[PDB]
């Protein structure tokens, strides 16, 4: 599923990313996921939901990428963020 995020300078995208730090059967489709999403925030507006797993950030594959590096990627694109997510629910 796709979400295009364009925010204003001083707001967030409105979500909490959570997942393994960089330091059998797949149960997660990716290492980082949305622990929560701000109701009526830029991220919730684009359709993102708690429990969405991050597959791509701004065209980059982040399935196996540690947390800080993914946050790094999400920030590089300033107020613009593109995400391919997968819902486990």
């Amino acid at each position: 599923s796709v979400a295009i995020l364009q925010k204003r300078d001083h707001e967030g995208f409105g979500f909490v990313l959570r997942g393994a730090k960089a330091e059998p059967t797949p149960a997660f489709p990716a290492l980082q996921y949305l622990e929560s999403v701000d109701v009526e925030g830029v991220a919730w507006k684009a359709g993102l939901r708690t429990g969405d797993f991050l597959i791509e950030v701004n065209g980059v594959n982040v399935v196996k990428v540690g947390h800080k590096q993914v946050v790094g990627l999400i920030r590089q694109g300033g107020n613009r963020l593109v995400m391919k997510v997968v819902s486990v629910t």
């Binding site: 967030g12 990313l17 959570r18 997942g19 393994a20 946050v71």
Partner: peptide
């Protein structure tokens, strides 16, 4: 595990 508000 880490969490980041974004």
């Amino acid at each position: 595990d880490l969490q980041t508000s974004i």
